[PDB]
Tab-separated table of C-alpha atoms in Angstrom:
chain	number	residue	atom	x	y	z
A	1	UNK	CA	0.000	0.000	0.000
A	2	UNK	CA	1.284	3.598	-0.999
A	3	UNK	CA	2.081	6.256	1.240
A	4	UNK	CA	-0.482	8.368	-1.009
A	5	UNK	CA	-3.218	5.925	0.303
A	6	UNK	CA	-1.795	6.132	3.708
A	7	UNK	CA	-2.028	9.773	3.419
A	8	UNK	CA	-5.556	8.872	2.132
A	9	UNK	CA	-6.267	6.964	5.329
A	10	UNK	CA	-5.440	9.348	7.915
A	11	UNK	CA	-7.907	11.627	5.765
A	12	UNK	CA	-10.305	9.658	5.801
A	13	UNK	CA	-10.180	9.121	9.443
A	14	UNK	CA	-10.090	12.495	9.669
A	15	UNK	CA	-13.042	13.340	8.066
A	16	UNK	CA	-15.071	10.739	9.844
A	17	UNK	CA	-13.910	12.158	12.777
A	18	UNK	CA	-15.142	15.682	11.257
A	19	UNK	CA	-18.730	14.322	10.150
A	20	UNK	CA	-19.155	12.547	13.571
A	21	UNK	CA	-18.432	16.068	15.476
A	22	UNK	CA	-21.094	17.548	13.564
A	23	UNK	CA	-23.071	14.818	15.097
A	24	UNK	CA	-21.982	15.442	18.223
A	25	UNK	CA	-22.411	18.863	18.362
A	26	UNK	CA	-26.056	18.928	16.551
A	27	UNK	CA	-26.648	16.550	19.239
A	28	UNK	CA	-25.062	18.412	21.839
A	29	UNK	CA	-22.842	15.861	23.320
A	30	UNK	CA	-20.275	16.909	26.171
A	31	UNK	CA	-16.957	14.915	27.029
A	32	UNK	CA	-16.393	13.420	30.440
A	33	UNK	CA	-13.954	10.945	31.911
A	34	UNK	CA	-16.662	8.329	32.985
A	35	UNK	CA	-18.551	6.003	30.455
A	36	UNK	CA	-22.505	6.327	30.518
A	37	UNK	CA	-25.158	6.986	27.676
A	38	UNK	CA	-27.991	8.386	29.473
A	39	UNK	CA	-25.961	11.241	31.637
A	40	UNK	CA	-24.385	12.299	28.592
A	41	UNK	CA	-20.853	12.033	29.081
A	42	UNK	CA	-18.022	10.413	26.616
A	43	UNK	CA	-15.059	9.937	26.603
A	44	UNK	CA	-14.181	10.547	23.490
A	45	UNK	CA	-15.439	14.306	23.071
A	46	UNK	CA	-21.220	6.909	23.067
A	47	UNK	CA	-18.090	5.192	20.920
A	48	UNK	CA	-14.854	4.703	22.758
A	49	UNK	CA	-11.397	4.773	21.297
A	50	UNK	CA	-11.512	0.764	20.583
A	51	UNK	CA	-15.131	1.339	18.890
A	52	UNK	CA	-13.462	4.070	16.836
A	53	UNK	CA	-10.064	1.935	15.702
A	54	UNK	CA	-12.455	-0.901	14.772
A	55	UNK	CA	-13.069	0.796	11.988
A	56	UNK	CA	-9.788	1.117	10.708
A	57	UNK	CA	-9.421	-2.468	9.391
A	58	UNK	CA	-12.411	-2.692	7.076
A	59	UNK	CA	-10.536	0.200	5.306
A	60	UNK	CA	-8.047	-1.183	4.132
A	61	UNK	CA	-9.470	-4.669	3.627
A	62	UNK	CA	-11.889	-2.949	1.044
A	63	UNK	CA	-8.781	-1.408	-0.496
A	64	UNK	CA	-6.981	-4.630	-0.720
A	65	UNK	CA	-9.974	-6.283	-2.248
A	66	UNK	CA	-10.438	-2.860	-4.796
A	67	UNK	CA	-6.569	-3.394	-5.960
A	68	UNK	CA	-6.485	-6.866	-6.369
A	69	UNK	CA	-10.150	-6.989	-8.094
A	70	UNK	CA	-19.997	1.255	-12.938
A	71	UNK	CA	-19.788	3.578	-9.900
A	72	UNK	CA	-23.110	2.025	-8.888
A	73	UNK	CA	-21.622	-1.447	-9.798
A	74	UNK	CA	-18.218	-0.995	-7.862
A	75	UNK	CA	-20.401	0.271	-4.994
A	76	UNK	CA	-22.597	-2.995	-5.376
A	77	UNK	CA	-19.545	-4.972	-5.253
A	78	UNK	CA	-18.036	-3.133	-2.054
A	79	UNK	CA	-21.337	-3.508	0.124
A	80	UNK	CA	-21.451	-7.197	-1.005
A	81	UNK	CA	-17.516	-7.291	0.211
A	82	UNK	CA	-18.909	-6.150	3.146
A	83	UNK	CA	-21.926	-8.127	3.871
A	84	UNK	CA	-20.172	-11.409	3.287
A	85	UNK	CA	-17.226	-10.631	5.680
A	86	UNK	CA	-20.003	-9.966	7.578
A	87	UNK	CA	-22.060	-13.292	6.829
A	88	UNK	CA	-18.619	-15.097	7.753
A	89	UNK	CA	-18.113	-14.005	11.033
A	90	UNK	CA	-21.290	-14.834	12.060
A	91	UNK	CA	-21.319	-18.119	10.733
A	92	UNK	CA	-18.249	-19.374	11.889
A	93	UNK	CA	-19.163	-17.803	15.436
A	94	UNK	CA	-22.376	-19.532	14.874
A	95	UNK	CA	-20.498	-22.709	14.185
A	96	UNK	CA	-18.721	-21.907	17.125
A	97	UNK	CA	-21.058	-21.109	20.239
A	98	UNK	CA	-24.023	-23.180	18.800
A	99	UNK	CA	-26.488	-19.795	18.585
A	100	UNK	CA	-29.665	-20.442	16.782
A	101	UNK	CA	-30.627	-19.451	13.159
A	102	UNK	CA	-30.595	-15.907	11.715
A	103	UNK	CA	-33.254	-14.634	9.175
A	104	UNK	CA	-29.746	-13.820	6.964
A	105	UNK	CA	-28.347	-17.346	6.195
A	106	UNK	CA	-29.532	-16.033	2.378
A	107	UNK	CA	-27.320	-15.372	-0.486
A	108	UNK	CA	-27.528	-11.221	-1.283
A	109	UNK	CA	-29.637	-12.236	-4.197
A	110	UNK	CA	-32.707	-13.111	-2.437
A	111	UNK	CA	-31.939	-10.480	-0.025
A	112	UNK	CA	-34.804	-7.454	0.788
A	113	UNK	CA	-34.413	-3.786	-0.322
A	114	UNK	CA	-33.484	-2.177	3.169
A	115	UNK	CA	-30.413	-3.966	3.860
A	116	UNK	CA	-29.358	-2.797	0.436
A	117	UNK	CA	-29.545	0.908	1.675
A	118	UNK	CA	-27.810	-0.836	4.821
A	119	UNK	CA	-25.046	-1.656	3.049
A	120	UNK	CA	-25.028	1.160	0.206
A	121	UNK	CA	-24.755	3.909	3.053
A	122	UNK	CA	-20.915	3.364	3.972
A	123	UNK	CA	-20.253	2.817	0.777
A	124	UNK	CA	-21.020	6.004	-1.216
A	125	UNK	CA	-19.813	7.689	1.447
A	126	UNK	CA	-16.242	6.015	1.335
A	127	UNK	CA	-16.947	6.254	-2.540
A	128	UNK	CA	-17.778	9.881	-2.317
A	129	UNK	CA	-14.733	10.379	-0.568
A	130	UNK	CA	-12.412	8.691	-2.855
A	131	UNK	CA	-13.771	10.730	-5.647
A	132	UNK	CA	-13.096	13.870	-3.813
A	133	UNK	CA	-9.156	12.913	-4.234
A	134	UNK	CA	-9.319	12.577	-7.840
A	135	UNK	CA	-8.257	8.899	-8.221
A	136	UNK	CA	-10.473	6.780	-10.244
A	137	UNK	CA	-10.861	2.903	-9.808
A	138	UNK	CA	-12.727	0.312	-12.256
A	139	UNK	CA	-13.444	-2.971	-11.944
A	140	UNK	CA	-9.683	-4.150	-14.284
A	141	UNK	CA	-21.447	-2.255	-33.963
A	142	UNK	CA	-22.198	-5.077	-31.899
A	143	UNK	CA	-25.208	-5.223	-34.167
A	144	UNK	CA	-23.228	-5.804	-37.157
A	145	UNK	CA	-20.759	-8.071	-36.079
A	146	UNK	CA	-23.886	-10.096	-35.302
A	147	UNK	CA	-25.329	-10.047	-38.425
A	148	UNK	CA	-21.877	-10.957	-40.292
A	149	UNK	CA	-21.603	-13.769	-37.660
A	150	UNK	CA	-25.035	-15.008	-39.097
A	151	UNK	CA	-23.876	-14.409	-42.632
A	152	UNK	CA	-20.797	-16.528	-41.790
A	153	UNK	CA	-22.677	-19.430	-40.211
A	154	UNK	CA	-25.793	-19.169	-43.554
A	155	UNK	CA	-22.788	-19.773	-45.924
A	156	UNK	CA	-21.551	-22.410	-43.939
A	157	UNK	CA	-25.079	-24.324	-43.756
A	158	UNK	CA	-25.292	-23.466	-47.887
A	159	UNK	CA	-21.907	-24.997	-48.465
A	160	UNK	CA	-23.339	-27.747	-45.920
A	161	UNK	CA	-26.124	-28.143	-47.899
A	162	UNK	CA	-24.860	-27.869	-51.374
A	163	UNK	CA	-22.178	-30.896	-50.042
A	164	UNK	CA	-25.969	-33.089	-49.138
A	165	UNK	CA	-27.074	-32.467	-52.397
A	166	UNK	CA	-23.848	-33.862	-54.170
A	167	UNK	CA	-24.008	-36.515	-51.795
């Protein structure tokens, strides 16, 4: 991974951090040194430090995937990413602990409509903010060659057929 994607990173976290003080402060949320959510008091001003760094990983997972793999579809493709990472955890831990059946042991095809927006929320935003940047990712007529494939095959079946006759 490139420095310029580091530096990418650490603007990125930065601008979450930005967008989630405008939350705070429409809000009205005031910092304190004990944890609670109903006296309104964080210590990170409801997230803590380890419920902020937990979101550093899927990052950069997403990038890996992104480098080693139109808008819309790339977007598709990264909230699938997500979902099944998300589908595997569970599962295994499922596996695991023996917990009962989720409504979600479905492949994203037969999936509802909400969960879509679910997972198309984090997206566009991450999308929206690599297209702030400038650099542009991809996934890495037609009428006539059709018709002069069917001319192609015609003659064939007329040289086909003229050979049946002579037989």
């Amino acid at each position: 991974i490139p420095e310029k994607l580091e530096y990418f990173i650490n603007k990125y976290a930065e601008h979450s951090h930005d967008k989630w003080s405008m939350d705070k402060l429409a809000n009205g949320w005031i910092y304190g040194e004990i944890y609670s959510d109903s006296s309104k008091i964080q210590p990170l001003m409801l997230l803590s430090e380890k419920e902020k760094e937990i979101y550093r990983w899927p990052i950069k997972e997403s990038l890996k995937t992104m480098l080693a793999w139109d808008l819309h579809a790339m977007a598709e493709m990264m909230a699938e990413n997500y979902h099944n990472i998300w589908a595997k955890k569970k599962k295994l831990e499922l596996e695991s602990k023996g917990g009962g059946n989720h409504p979600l042991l479905v492949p994203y095809d037969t999936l509802t409509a909400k969960e879509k927006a679910k997972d198309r929320e984090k997206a566009q935003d991450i999308f929206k903010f690599l297209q702030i940047s400038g650099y542009v990712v991809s996934r890495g007529x037609x009428x006539x060659x059709x018709x002069x494939x069917x001319x192609x095959x015609x003659x064939x079946x007329x040289x086909x057929x003229x050979x049946x006759x002579x037989x």
